[PDB]
RNA sequence: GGUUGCGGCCAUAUCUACCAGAAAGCACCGUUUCCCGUCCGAUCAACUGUAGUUAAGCUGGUAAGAGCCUGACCGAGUAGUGUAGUGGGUGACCAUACGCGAAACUCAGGUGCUGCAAUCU
RNA sequence: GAGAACAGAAAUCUCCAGUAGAACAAAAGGGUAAAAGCCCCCUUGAUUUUGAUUUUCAGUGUGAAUACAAACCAUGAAAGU
């Protein structure tokens, strides 16, 4: 029945978040040098005392219990009792710097100046009055590409008198959409540059 | 393409960083002792370890660009370069990098009286559980070199951070002890690195809540002599020790949150 | 004025776990009100579930069921 | 999901502060204690001085040595009078909180406990199909935990093997809903009382029907009870008492497959009938009365107890677990001879019946007037106690297997724990969000299981008086639940037409 | 009532909290005793208003299940 | 005509990958990947099938090579009363039941660790099914072993859509057909069908049953008795060793080829 | 080792291949006659390239084939050999002990001709191997066949000579 | 000492050609009613170890084979590389004190070590 | 590299060898081979909704965007993703 009460001159400090213990007591070079054959015993005894103190602190930490069963999300079962580790005290350098805040774009500055609050983004579904169905407003089977599949398109009077009359209006609208998309891409690239 | 985007997002910086990964790089000259020590350290580090196999002409204190290139290519913030020389026998260089640039480097030499993992032939711990740490020596808190050693080893073997710990996972402890107290103007004492496995028994004096602890040595046992050092710049130290402070609630005077979750204000 | 079909209308909006229920139930009763603390914002909780007090006596039985 | 508030910065700093260690002092002085029994109030040794670091096991050995029974010790628990139980040691239980000083004496009440332990059920073993309609009733075999009988609304019962979680037999004799199922206390015959005013007897080993059905009731069967083995003469089979909606309790002798007595004193539907260990029968009915009949007096009504203002829904006896278990135990041992079976049943009954001087058999009745009444019908006609506090009707009531506690499951989404002797209120089990239908104890009287309308089961620890584990999984309301005799499995069933088996 | 999720007439009316016919609201369903598959107690759900409270003096809604 | 450049630039895989018996993609996710970061140790219920034996083991991965906690084989079944069909679905079920009961008996869960200092009662033992390089098909013997272990009392997380009797149309199982496969009803049905249709096939197959005079209706009884015997006595009794280690080593080394010395090789060359 | 019963050469598979070139009704008729021949549904082949000369687009249907294993394969092989009147060239055999031959008309096999069917030919290809050849095809513990165990052209020619007693023509 | 299951180190383990392997195991091999999947029970799935074989799978040995690997008190503290005492020299450049520091080449050698569990004439 | 009617240098099938020399993204000085490549099965939810938390918009700030987290969701026998 060996005791679990370790008496130390210098009090050991604990970082329970990292499960680490630090003792700054006096270490003798004679008992730890390679010339002494009891160095392993000395190191094992000191480490045993430090680990005993660390385990005492860990078992004195507060404990979390739950009532949920196995097979559920969370990873903790009712029979499992966990320790609540505090935040680590030791400060260590990060592997990467903190992410810098992105500079405000031209649109963001304009919206802030004009008091334009952002849209609510409820969803991508809009009601088609010509039919009785809800359709996406963009993307896969979006409503913005219905003119390409439209069976009959009236030719505009403004296109008359130009050489572009013989072109399919569906092709012209696809070209205009691609031009708008490329303009948006160019504006994004410009915002990245600035 | 979406897999590539996911990899890039995983590699990019974040408020809560991932577990630091360690790359083990052999040098131009390597030995079987170095290979076995590297294997044992990689076993202690896994599954946060990547190992190269070929020989690499790397001199950290003459150039840094190959190390920086490897760190950026592999997303490994920890580097262990193993080399040999007549002046430096069994040299392990630990390079910790901040932002794909050399943050700090230490260079230790392994003494000859070392025993590998297979010498002990004892039952060991399950793969992938965080260890406990013990550090013996006031120089860990006072001397800058041992400050760097303690920070490097805690960062290297800390693993995944968590707020909840299962008691069945507390299996092994890494002990780093200074070979006796020293004074100014003396050679730096070697650092002794040991690994122990825990055993518990009824104590009959601390009740049924405090068991008597015992240790069984696992290995490897290593003695590191401090050959070379390379410290970071103060501004780099500050930039690496900056805190995000975004996730936590801002503290406001006379405003508290009670147990029910109501926001309460104090008047005087 | 239209409402689009969506599966978000039929999902649960608020749930509470048994551990959270027990924590708030034990906290309700241990509060020590301070006269110099004011209520800045009330937490949103299922108070009908959380407000259960042990009563020494039961209400009278409804006699119109039997007679 | 709603979360508890996070800890504050000061609380995180306090967490990062080093923790105190609760270690046993070495200079702890001796403590004077006085032993006393909970049931009898008998003092052992007067004031005796013990070390302050005395452990529970060492204190138990000291009590055994005082009593002179060290050769065959019996595990006990200790409480101290605010009553606090002894968890690990005297210092941490009482001295460390500082409620009692070292100079003052400590009065320790000792209470016997079970040698074995039941682990709580924490997961579902299986979800077995087979029934065509909603599951109405369930029961376990008394001799073994591998046989479960379940009666449902598809006019059938099923015998399930619990080792492989597969159906073993189908019982398809009845024409209407199988309202109640029961197992013989010797484990030989399963009795099923149905909606068509009939009772059928089945051999479970062959899954077969013994002769024709028992007939004579005009309305559906409400409850079934068996004659206790310790009262049945050796070489004879126990008789079957049945209550029904028509207001009559019929007694059937299965040896000749006939009916002996038809008690007809009730003016309304009889809710439940229970056959006690002293040759008496207790019937609770919708006419707000409880009738006490004698089997030895040609089925004559000895007493009429009238204290409720509404229908008495359920009743339970102190020795009900012993009467249900018969001669078997938690180890599943089978007596070789009827004489040995009768003697073992008598001993099992007496260990609960005769204590604290005179043998008593307390009864508890839970009614629709939101209340319960605790009676001792042998000695007195007035009720011993009244248990109040439920805001809705008390649907179910159960004595603990040792008879020391009463648990009441009500329609106000609550369970209540009361003392089994004087009926004083102890605690409330909360956590169900719908009405609790029925409840069941474990064998060692330390764990409780309850099924509710909220499609969930809940297992509660009696000692800590808190919820242990919540068990979801059923798709609809759970109507029946039961715990095995050895405390290894829990069966449940309801509107989802699936039998849920749960294990540790 | 816990919140006004969607007034079909206009998002301006939604953020003003107008209660007309067809409005999606959030209601407290604690007394209904709903439990999920994972054992969580449901205490908030969605409902649609089916009447004109300005006409009949009360709010009637149907729970969306 | 593979070149020296190809041989030099060749990159050999792992040893277990070369002699393909281990899926490292499955192994890394089974070992190094954790649902939560609470550092809970993991265990694998490894199930393997040879042409004549069923191997069930409980294995914990370790940094020095994994360690087996308990094991069970189909050749232990003659002790409990199973002598025929040692690799069928019922045999796999019995082996899973045996390893579950043996592990529970060894751990003492059903009739001083650091967890005992914090929690009152022991946890159920959780193992994850490991199948190696096997196909996931409905009605597999490895899932039969999984079902046997689950009924024995080990907490093995699993769904029930790969058991026999699982309907593909409706997400439900046939527990009667599951019981038939547990107690070998398919084998008995094949035996009866062979006896009714083709007597020569019934003479060729199931010759051991005829030699031991085992009727097709006794399969359920012998499987039930085997399950009862396994539950009653799940301890591991090793086979009696007729000879000793030195005798085995010497008699094997007598046939195993001895090495020839380098001087002898040089003398042979010269 | 020659007396060991596991070195016997047997039929692994008989593949009947019909490359029609153009997808459509003729391919459908080829599939139908292959089904009526072998008792099994044929399987189509997707295009691997796009050639204007061959009239083939990208990812289209060009050929069908049937694999037959067992006594049905033996019966179809004996029908093919009866049509080919027991005469095979030396170059018909490959270096790996597998041999094929083309039949111009399926009507010679004994199939009743139909006006809608038309005329179709097919390539017979027979694969020979010894027992133990599943080491290269099994999922677990895949290994190579031994040097002495591999089927060779002379060995399969000797097996054919012993089996069908049909001469192998040098030219 | 042989072998089987799960592995660590991932060529001392790989590639090509012969020989040996008593017992056990492994494997080839027999069959298609049930679960399952294919054009094809060829792989996958299931049943019997019943009919046989160690011909292959697998292990060991052999080859001045290819490939690969380990020690050097072997090159060598060398080439190379960075400062410097006012070291000379109006000159392209050179020994020196202190740091950092290779490979080609040569000698000596080699063709798997090991953890857990079970089994063997 | 060998074999098979049209069918040849390129159409279709079979055997052996085949470290990737093919095809995906990046510009590795060590990316991926029981795959990160090709094919098949399931999911059309991906602009879910809760938050006393971070940041920003007032005359409509218990609202909306925004960051993070959680509960869910999909799939898989499962580990897990």
DSSP per residue, A152-166: --PPPSTTTTSGGGG
Q: Cβ of residue B74 near strand H, that is under 7 Å?
A: no
**CA of F124 vs chain D CAs: smallest distance (Å):** 7
Q: Which residue has the tokens 């087996």?
A: F68
Selecting from F118, F126, F157 the residue whose C-beta is nearest the C-beta of A59 gives: F118
| Cα F200 from chain centre | 33
Chain A residue closest in CA terms to D121: A69
Phi first, then psi, for residue B249 (nearest 5°) are -70, 135
Q: Alpha-carbon distance D135 to D480, whole Å?
A: 8
CA atoms within 13 A on the CB side of G78: 8
Residue G7, both tokens = 């070195």
Nearest 10 degrees: CA dihedral of D466, D471, D472, D475? -120
Terminal alpha carbon distance of chain G? 33
Whether CB of G103 is under 7 Å from strand H: the answer is no
Report the alpha-carbon distance of residue F41 to residue B129 in Å, rounded: 8
Contacting subunits of D (3+ beta carbon pairs below 8 A): A, B, C, E, F
| A98 alpha-carbon distance from chain centroid | 13
Contacts of A33 (CB under 8 A, 6+ apart): A39, B179, B180
Residue A54 contacts residue A6 (beta carbons within 8 Å): no
Residue F159 contacts by C-beta under 8 Å, 6 or more apart in sequence?
Answer: none
Which tokens is D478 given? 């759970």
Distance CA F84, CA F191 (A): 13
D436: three-class secondary structure by DSSP:
strand
How far, in Å, CA of D122 to CA of A69, rounded?
6
Neighbour-count burial of G37, counting CB atoms closer than 10 A to its CB (0-12 exposed, 13-18 middle, 19+ buried):
buried
Which residue, counting CA atoms, is nearest to the C1' of nucleotide I61? E15
Number of neighbours of residue C60 by Cβ within 10 angstroms: 9
**With contact defined as beta carbons under 8 Å apart, do D377 and D305 qualify?**
yes
CA–C1' span, G84 to H15, in Å? 43
By what technique were these coordinates determined? cryo-EM
Dihedral Cα D124, D127, D131, D137, nearest 10 deg: 0
C46 with E43: Cβ contact below 8 A: yes
Judged by CB atoms closer than 8 Å, whether chains meet at B249 and D6 is answered as yes
Radius of gyration of chain D (CA): 25
* Tokens standing for residue D503: 């294990």
CA–CA gap between residue E43 and residue E32 (Å, rounded):
8
Q: What is the spatial distance between Cα B178 and Cα B188, in angstroms, rounded to a whole number?
A: 9
Q: What whole-number distance in Å separates Cα of residue D24 and Cα of residue D127?
A: 49
F23 contacts B117 by C-beta, under 8 angstroms = no
Q: How distant, in Å, are the alpha carbons of A15, B135, F229, F247, F269 from that of A88?
A: 6, 16, 54, 60, 70
Q: Å resolution of this model?
A: 2.4
Q: Determine contact, residues B16/B96, Cβ cutoff 8 Å.
A: no
Size of interface B-F (CB pairs under 8 A): 76
Q: Which residues contact F236 (CB under 8 A, 6 or more apart)?
A: F70, F102
Q: How many residues are listed for chain F in this entry?
A: 270
Name chain B contacts of D9, Cβ cutoff 8 Å: 248, 251
Judge if the beta carbon of F207 is closer than 7 A to nucleic acid strand H: yes
Q: Comparing C-alpha atoms, which of F120, F41, F159 is closest to residue D120?
A: F120
CB contact under 8 A, F116 and B208: yes
D434 at interface of E, judged by CB pairs closer than 8 A: yes
Query: Which residues contact residue F240 at a Cβ distance below 8 angstroms, ignoring those fewer than 6 apart?
Result: none
Which SS3 state, helix, strand or coil, does residue A62 take? coil
Distance between CA atoms of residues A114 and A103, nearest Å: 18
Alpha-carbon dihedral sign for residues D368, D373, D377, D380? negative
Whether residue D276 contacts residue D291, with contact meaning beta carbons closer than 8 Å, is answered with no
Pairing of strands D270-275, B49-51: unpaired
Those residues with Cβ within 8 angstroms of residue D379's Cβ, 6 or more apart along the chain or in another chain: D360
Phi and psi dihedrals of F60, rounded to 5? -115, 125
Q: Which of G94, G97, G101 has its CA nearest to residue G130? A: G97
Angle at G106 between CA G104 and CA G111, to 5 degrees: 165
Measured in degrees and rounded to the nearest 5, phi and psi for residue B260 equal: -75, -10
Q: How would you label D160-199 residue by residue, b for 16+ Cβ within 10 Å and e otherwise?
A: bbbbbbbbbbebebbeebbbbbbbbbbbbbbbbbbbbbbb
Report whether D456 contacts D472 (CB < 8 A).
Answer: yes
Please give the Cα distance from F99 to F145 (Å, whole number): 9
Contact D156/D132 with Cβ under 8 angstroms? yes
For the residues of E1-65, what is the DSSP string, one character each? --EEEE-SS-HHHHHHT---TT-EEEEE-GGGTEE-TTSPEEEEEEEEE-S-HHHHSS--EEE--
User: How many C-beta atoms surround the C-beta of residue F19 within 10 A?
Assistant: 12
F84 CB below 7 A from strand H atoms: yes
Residue B60: both structure tokens together? 């950290």
Radius of gyration of chain B (CA): 22
Q: Helical H runs in D17-97?
A: 56-67, 90
G151 vs G160: CA distance, rounded Å: 13
SS3 breakdown of chain G: % helix, strand, coil, rounded to 5?
30, 25, 45
- Using CB atoms, which residue from D1, D455, D473 is nearest to E40? D1
Nearest to D471 by CA among D483, D479, D460: D460
- Nearest DNA or RNA nucleotide to F129 (CA to C1'): I78
Q: What is the DSSP letter of D94?
A: I
What is the dotted CATH code of the domain comprising D123-503? Answer: 2.130.10.10
Task: Name, in order, each residue with C-beta under 8 angstroms of D138's C-beta and a sequence gap of 6 or more.
Answer: D148, D149, D150, D151, D181, D480, D481, D482, D491, D492, D493, D499
Contact state of A134 with C17 under an 8 Å Cβ cutoff: no
Backbone angles phi, psi at F232, to 5 degrees: -75, -45
Q: How far apart are CA B19 and CA F4, in angstroms?
A: 42
Interface test with D, best of E28, E32, E39 (most D CBs within 10 A): E39
d(CA F95, CA F76): 9
Q: What 3-state class would DSSP assign to F75? A: helix
Residue B45 Cα, gap to closest chain D Cα (Å): 27
Token readout for B156 is 């290297």
Where residue B137 falls (left for φ over 0; alpha for ψ -120 to 50; beta otherwise) is left
Give the residues across from D34 on adjacent strands.
D47, D107
Point out which residues pair with D55 in neighbouring strands: D89
Query: Which nucleotide lies closest to F143 by the C1' atom and the CA atom?
Result: I77
Nearest to B16 by CA among B249, B248, B251, B250: B248
- A63 CB contacts (<8 Å, ≥6 apart)? A81, A82, A83, A84, F118
| Nearest partner of F194 among F183, F206, F184, F185, judged by Cα | F206
- Are residues B123 and F62, on separate chains, in Cβ contact within 8 Å? yes
List all nucleotides in chain I with at least one atom under 7 A from a protein Cβ. Answer: 1-8, 10-20, 24-26, 28-30, 34-37, 44-58, 60-73, 76-81
A96-111 burial: b if 16+ Cβ within 10 Å, else e: bebeeeeeeeeeeeee
B207: left (phi over 0), alpha (psi -120 to 50) or beta: left
């Amino acid at each position: 029945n060996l005791p679990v009460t370790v008496e130390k001159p210098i009090p050991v400090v604990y970082d329970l978040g990292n499960l680490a213990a630090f003792d700054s007591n006096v270490l003798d070079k004679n008992d730890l040098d390679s010339s002494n054959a009891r160095r392993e015993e000395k190191i094992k005894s000191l480490t045993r005392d430090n680990v005993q103190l660390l385990i005492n602190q860990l078992l004195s930490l507060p404990m979390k219990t739950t009532t949920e069963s196995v097979g559920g999300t969370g990873g903790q079962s009712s029979v499992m009792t966990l320790l609540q580790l505090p935040d680590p005290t030791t400060d260590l350098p990060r592997e990467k710097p903190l992410p810098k805040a992105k500079a405000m774009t031209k649109w963001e500055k304009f919206a802030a100046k004009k008091g334009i609050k952002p849209k609510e983004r409820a969803g991508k579904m809009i009601y088609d009055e010509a039919s009785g169905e809800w359709v996406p407003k963009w993307g896969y089977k979006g409503a913005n590409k219905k003119l390409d599949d439209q069976w009959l398109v009236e030719v505009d009077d403004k296109v008359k008198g130009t050489d572009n009359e013989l072109i399919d209006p569906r092709t012209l609208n696809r070209a205009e959409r691609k031009r708008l998309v490329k303009k948006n891409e160019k504006q994004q690239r410009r915002n990245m540059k600035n | 393409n979406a897999r590539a985007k996911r990899a890039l997002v995983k590699r990019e910086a974040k408020l809560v960083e991932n577990v630091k990964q360690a790359l083990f790089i052999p040098g131009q000259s390597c030995n079987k002792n170095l290979h076995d020590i590297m294997v044992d350290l990689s076993a202690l580090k896994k599954p946060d370890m990547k190992r190269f196999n070929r020989k690499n002409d790397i001199h950290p204190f003459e150039d840094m660009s190959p190390l920086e290139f490897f760190s950026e290519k592999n997303d490994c913030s920890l580097m262990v370069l193993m080399t040999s020389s007549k002046k430096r026998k069994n040299n392990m260089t630990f390079i910790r990098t901040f932002g794909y640039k050399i943050y700090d480097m230490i260079e230790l030499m392994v003494a000859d009286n070392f025993k590998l993992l297979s010498d002990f032939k004892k039952l060991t711990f399950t793969v992938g559980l965080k260890p406990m740490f013990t550090f013996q020596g006031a120089a860990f808190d006072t001397h800058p070199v041992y400050k760097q050693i303690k920070s490097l080893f805690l960062d290297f073997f800390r693993g995944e951070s968590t707020d909840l710990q299962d008691v069945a996972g507390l299996q092994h402890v890494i002990s780093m002890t200074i070979q006796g107290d020293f004074q100014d103007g003396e050679p730096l004492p070697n650092v002794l690195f040991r690994v122990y496995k825990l055993k518990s028994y009824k104590s009959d004096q601390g009740g049924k809540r405090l068991p008597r602890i015992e240790l069984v040595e696992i290995g490897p046992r290593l003695d590191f002599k401090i050959g070379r050092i390379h410290t970071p710049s103060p501004d780099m130290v500050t930039e690496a020790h900056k805190k995000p402070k975004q996730l936590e609630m801002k503290t406001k005077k006379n405003v508290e949150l009670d147990i029910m979750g109501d926001k309460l204000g104090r008047i005087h | 004025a239209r409402v689009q079909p969506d599966r978000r209308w039929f999902g649960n909006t608020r749930v509470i776990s048994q551990d959270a229920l027990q924590h708030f139930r034990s906290a309700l009763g241990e509060t020590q009100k301070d006269t110099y603390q004011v209520l800045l914002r009330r937490n949103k909780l299922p108070m009908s579930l959380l407000e259960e007090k042990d009563a020494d006596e039961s209400p009278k039985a409804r006699i119109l069921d039997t007679e | 999901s709603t979360l508890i508030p996070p800890p504050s910065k000061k609380q995180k700093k306090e967490a990062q502060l080093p923790r105190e260690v609760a270690i046993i002092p070495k200079d702890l002085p001796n403590v004077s204690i006085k032993f006393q029994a909970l049931d009898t109030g008998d003092n052992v040794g007067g004031a005796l001085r013990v070390p302050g670091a005395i452990s529970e096991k060492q204190l138990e050995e000291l009590l055994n040595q005082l009593n002179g029974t060290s050769d065959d010790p019996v595990p006990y628990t200790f409480s101290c009078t605010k009553t606090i139980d002894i968890t690990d040691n005297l210092y941490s239980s009482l001295i460390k909180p500082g409620y009692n000083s070292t100079e003052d004496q400590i009065t320790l009440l000792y209470t016997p406990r079970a040698v074995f332990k039941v682990k709580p059920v924490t997961r579902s073993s299986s979800a077995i199909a087979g029934h065509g309609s909603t599951i109405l009733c369930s029961a376990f075999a008394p001799h073994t935990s591998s046989r479960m009988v379940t009666g449902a609304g598809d006019n059938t019962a099923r015998i399930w093997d619990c080792d492989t979680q597969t159906p073993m037999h189908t019982l398809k004799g009845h024409y209407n809903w199988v309202l109640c199922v029961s197992w013989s206390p010797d484990g030989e015959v399963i009795a099923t009382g149905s909606m068509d005013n009939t009772i059928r007897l089945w051999d479970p080993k062959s899954g077969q029907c013994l002769g024709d059905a028992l007939r004579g009731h005009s309305k559906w069967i409400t409850s079934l009870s068996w004659e206790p083995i310790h009262l049945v003469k050796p070489g004879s089979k126990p008789r079957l008492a049945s209550s029904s909606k028509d207001g009559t309790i019929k007694i059937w002798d299965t040896v000749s497959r006939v009916c002996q007595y038809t008690m007809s004193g009730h003016t309304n539907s009889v809710s439940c009938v229970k056959w006690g260990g002293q040759g008496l029968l207790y019937s609770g009915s919708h006419d707000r009365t409880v009738r006490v009949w004698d089997i030895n007096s040609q089925g004559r009504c000895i007493n009429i107890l009238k204290s409720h203002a509404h229908w008495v829904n359920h009743l339970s006896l102190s020795t009900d677990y012993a009467l249900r278990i018969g001669a078997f135990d938690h180890t599943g041992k089978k007596p070789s001879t009827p004489e040995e079976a009768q003697k073992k049943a008598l001993e099992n009954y007496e260990k609960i019946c005769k204590k604290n001087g005179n043998s008593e058999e307390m009864m508890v009745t839970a009614s629709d007037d939101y209340t319960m009444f605790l009676w001792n019908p042998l000695k007195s006609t007035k009720p011993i106690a009244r248990m109040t506090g439920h805001q809705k009707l008390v649907n179910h009531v159960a004595f603990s297997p040792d008879g020391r506690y009463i648990v009441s499951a009500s329609f106000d989404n609550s369970i209540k724990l009361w003392d089994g002797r004087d009926g004083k209120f102890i605690s409330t089990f909360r956590g169900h969000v719908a009405s609790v239908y029925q409840v069941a104890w474990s064998s060692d009287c330390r764990l409780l299981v309850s099924c509710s309308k909220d499609t969930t089961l809940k297992v509660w620890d009696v000692r800590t008086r808190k919820l242990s584990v919540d068990l979801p999984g059923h798709k609809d309301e759970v109507y029946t639940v039961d715990w095995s005799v050895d405390g290894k499995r829990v069966c449940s069933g309801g509107k989802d037409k699936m039998v849920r088996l749960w294990t540790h | 009532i816990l919140a006004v999720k969607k007034n079909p007439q206009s998002p301006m009316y939604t953020q003003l909290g107008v209660l007309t016919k067809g409005t999606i609201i959030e209601v407290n369903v604690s007394e209904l005793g709903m439990v999920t598959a994972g054992g969580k107690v449901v205490w908030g759900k969605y409902a649609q208003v089916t009447n004109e409270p300005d006409r009949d003096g009360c709010v009637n809604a149907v729970l969306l299940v | 005509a593979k070149s020296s450049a190809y041989s030099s630039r060749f990159q050999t895989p792992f040893r277990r990958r070369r002699e393909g018996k281990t899926d490292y993609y499955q192994r890394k996710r089974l070992v190094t990947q954790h649902k939560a970061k609470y550092n809970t140790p993991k265990y694998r219920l490894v199930v393997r099938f040879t042409n004549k034996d069923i191997i069930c083991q409980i294995i914990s991965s370790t940094i020095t090579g994994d360690v087996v906690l308990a094991a069970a084989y189909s050749h232990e079944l003659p002790r409990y009363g199973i002598t025929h069909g040692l690799t069928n679905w019922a045999a796999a079920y019995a082996t899973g039941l045996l390893i579950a009961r043996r592990t529970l008996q060894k751990l003492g869960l059903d009739e001083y660790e650091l967890t005992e200092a914090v929690e009152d009662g022991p946890r159920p033992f959780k193992v994850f099914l490991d199948i190696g390089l096997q196909r996931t098909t409905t009605g597999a013997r490895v899932f039969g072993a999984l079902k046997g272990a689950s009924d024995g009392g080990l907490y093995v997380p699993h769904s029930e859509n790969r058991f026999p009797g699982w309907d593909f149309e409706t997400e439900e199982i046939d527990p009667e057909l599951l019981r038939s496969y547990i107690f070998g009803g398919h084998v008995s049905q094949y035996m009866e069908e062979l006896a009714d249709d083709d007597e020569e096939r019934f003479s060729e197959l199931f010759k051991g049953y005829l030699a031991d005079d085992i009727d097709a209706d006794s399969l359920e009884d012998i499987y039930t008795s085997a399950h009862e015997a396994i539950r009653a006595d799940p301890a591991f009794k090793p086979t009696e060793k007729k000879f000793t280690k030195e005798q085995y080593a010497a008699e094997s080394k007598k046939y195993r080829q001895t090495k020839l010395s380098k001087e002898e090789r040089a003398a042979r060359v010269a | 080792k020659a007396q060991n019963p596991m070195r016997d050469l047997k039929i692994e598979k008989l593949v009947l291949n019909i490359s029609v070139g153009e997808s459509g009704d003729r391919l459908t008729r080829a599939s139908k006659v292959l089904e009526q021949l072998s008792g099994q549904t044929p399987v189509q082949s997707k295009a691997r390239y796009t050639v204007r000369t061959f009239g083939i687009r990208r990812n289209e249907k060009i050929a069908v084939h049937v694999t037959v294993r067992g006594p049905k394969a033996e019966e179809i092989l004996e029908r093919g050999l009866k049509v080919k009147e027991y005469q095979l060239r030396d170059r018909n055999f490959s270096a790996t002990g597998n041999f094929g031959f083309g039949i111009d008309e399926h009507i010679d096999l004994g199939i009743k001709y139909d006006p809608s069917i038309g005329i179709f030919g097919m390539d017979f290809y027979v694969v020979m191997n010894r027992p133990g050849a599943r080491v290269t095809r099994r999922k677990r513990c895949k290994g190579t066949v031994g040097n002495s165990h591999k089927t060779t052209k002379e060995d399969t020619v000797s097996w054919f000579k012993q089996k069908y007693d049909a001469d192998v023509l040098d030219k």
